[PDB]
Paper text:
Mammalian Argonaute (Ago) proteins use ~22 nt short RNA guides to target partially complementary sites generally found in the 3’ UTRs of mRNAs, recruiting additional factors that promote post-transcriptional gene silencing through translational repression and induction of mRNA decay. miRNAs form a complex regulatory network, modulating diverse pathways in metazoan biology. For hepatitis C virus (HCV), binding of liver-abundant miR-122 stabilizes the viral RNA and regulates viral translation. The interaction between the HCV genome and the liver-abundant miRNA miR-122 was the first direct viral RNA-host miRNA interaction to be discovered and is the best-studied to date. Here, we investigate the structural basis for these activities, taking into consideration that miRNAs function in complex with Argonaute (Ago) proteins.
Residue numbers in the entry: 22 to 295, 307 to 333, 339 to 819, 838 to 859
Write the structure that this text describes.
Amino acid sequence: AFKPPPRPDFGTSGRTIKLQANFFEMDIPKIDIYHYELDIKPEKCPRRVNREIVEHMVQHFKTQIFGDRKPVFDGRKNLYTAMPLPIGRDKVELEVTLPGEGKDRIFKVSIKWVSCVSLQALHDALSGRLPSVPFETIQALDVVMRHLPSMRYTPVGRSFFTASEGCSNPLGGGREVWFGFHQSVRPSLWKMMLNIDVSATAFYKAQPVIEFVCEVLDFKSIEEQQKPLTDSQRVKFTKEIKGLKVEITHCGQMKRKYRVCNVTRRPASHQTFPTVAQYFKDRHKLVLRYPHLPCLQVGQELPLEVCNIVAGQRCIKKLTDNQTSTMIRATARSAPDRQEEISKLMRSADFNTDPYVREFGIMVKDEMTDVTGRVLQPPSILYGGRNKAIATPVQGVWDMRNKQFHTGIEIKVWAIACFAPQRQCTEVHLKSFTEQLRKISRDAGMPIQGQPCFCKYAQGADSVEPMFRHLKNTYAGLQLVVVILPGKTPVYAEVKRVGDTVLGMATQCVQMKNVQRTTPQTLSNLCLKINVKLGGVNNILLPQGRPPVFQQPVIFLGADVTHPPAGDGKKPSIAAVVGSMDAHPNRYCATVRVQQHRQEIIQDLAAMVRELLIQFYKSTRFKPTRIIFYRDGVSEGQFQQVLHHELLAIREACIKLEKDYQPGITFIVVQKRHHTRLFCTDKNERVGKSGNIPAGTTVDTKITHPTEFDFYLCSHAGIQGTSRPSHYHVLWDDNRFSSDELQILTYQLCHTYVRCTRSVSIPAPAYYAHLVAFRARYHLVDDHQALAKAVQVHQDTLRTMYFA
RNA sequence: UGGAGUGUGACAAUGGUGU
RNA sequence: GCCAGCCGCCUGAUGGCGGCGACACUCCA
Ligand SMILES: [Ba+2]
Ligand SMILES: [Ba+2]
């Protein structure tokens, strides 16, 4: 096994900044708690009614089994007590009746002593005496902290939602925003923390289906529809209730929870039922109030006044762009807004009154955790030309105005293939676009010497490969093909398949709307991409400002795996790995593979890293003495696996390059998907309307691991909403990095992303790896080895950053 | 397909089981 | 334990081919 190195030091670089984090300190006793296992018969029940069963079991066998003890329940098979039960260590069988009268099911439950979970061991791990934190104890504490919320609120994953209080938040036809919160127990130095963040989703309004139709079909009242429903109205009302659940209410106090299927075009009166309207006057004595609305077909092969909408449905449906817009009005709050909302939620949830967390002697603080962060100094960015301009990122941003590329490509043979309609993308557009692009190019030190040698329209994907062939054969020295497109078109994937994998020709696509009208910003970022695609070097980190790691040859790797949505039989997951090819580091080379459907481990990593090392040795004439590996998208539970496989893969790739070649490996996992938020304590340190922490804000205390080498770094400037600081976890480090050195290196690498002049949220290696997987997915658009070949890039473009 | 960011979306950590 | 969801297009759900590895919003010289 490979265990991650401990935190080497605590880091002191940068200017300090006071922060608050959405972690609330917990007070955890040092006594042991007791874990029992449950099995409820039958097992054809939702998780909610298993919780009701267990609650009635605790209330019924109070004097026999439990007593004053108030246990907690996972929902499936895990019960926990703060005191041992009198049942001993052997299984016990109990009979639990379920109340309701209209339906009374009998359940056979079995309680069995499993284990004695030690909170003292948890405290030992929180101090660092024990190196690794017990996951099972963390799970027990979690179950304890979400026992009551799982029953008083609506559970959705690790979040809980409710219907506000009074004034709802109307969304659209039959929906409304529910506000909720994610909750999770996390370990940290000396103390457990309760991590709380706010969230929202969409639920169906618990209204009678009449109101449903009124809001779906825009009726001031139901008396509006004094005629039968029209063609488009039936299908409209169908697409909104095709699978929802309704409650038949023509019954007494007794209710129903029958699901829904389709909608008829027969208004009850005119539907032969071997009519329906007739059926409701004789079977039950209920004259229909609206015998002109349609019926709700059920299941697979009823009036709208008899049905209601079953409260609590989560609306798994997709939302209208206007419901998405109102959702973002409600959810993407400024950082102070979200801070205040989390604090208010924690002040109202009253965890220090939950009888179950108090049964276990736990207390939760009401205030966010104070964290002393550090704003790291941003690197200076060296540009080119007679000026040799230096750019200083200011709040994570700089501009290329009055600056020229470090090394700018002279473009002197290029073509234009316009797959947009000539009627819409006229020749005046092409002329003025060329003029403006050339002006911006010359301004940036990437001059385009003369008009395009070739400039023609075309249509259809079938035209792509022939044309390019012609272009490659009839125009010598062809550097670039600009491909104007009319929007999302199958022509794009074909352009990339031909230019990247078949012929090895560099292409730059551009949307019609950016040729008809140009702006300096769009043309400039496009020039960035064009330059690096022709081998340019837009800029480099100021050489002297870099950490000491650059005093010897070093290669930086970025790796990512993209998966398809669940359900696809094969749709192989795409693994991409990129590697730096110079000391700057600016140029990166890519490798990609298809592998088992939804597998996170990069199976063929050894071969890919071998390719990258070979290219590095060829380009620099030296072998790296250090390998810095940035690995994206790995969960805690996958650490052991991925580390064991991929560390060994890298070592193999090394020794396959040379017998005794053992460079030091730094394996770092990059994670953006978490629920950690950081807020400025001083209103003066807030940046740009959103009110976020400054770019470069770093945290490696109070919410990080108690013993291991992890840290939050927010390297980007937040625009709208609350910034998501990237989290970094060092799974392996032969090179004995200091906290400061590694944090600074990560930050500086975040300024080497060629596609834009701003510090981005993750290091350029990782971002490039994502881009490479994206392009690979595009290359598969038209057998396993067939796919593996289709995703193989031509040898001439492999030399370039075609994925920019 | 100029580009970055953050909201929703991952049904492994979830959810169904009288016309 | 058995089961898996949503949206399109065609035959007009008795099937078949595609998406949800995205959409949305904010913001740049
Ligand atoms: Ba089950
Ligand atoms: Ba990933």
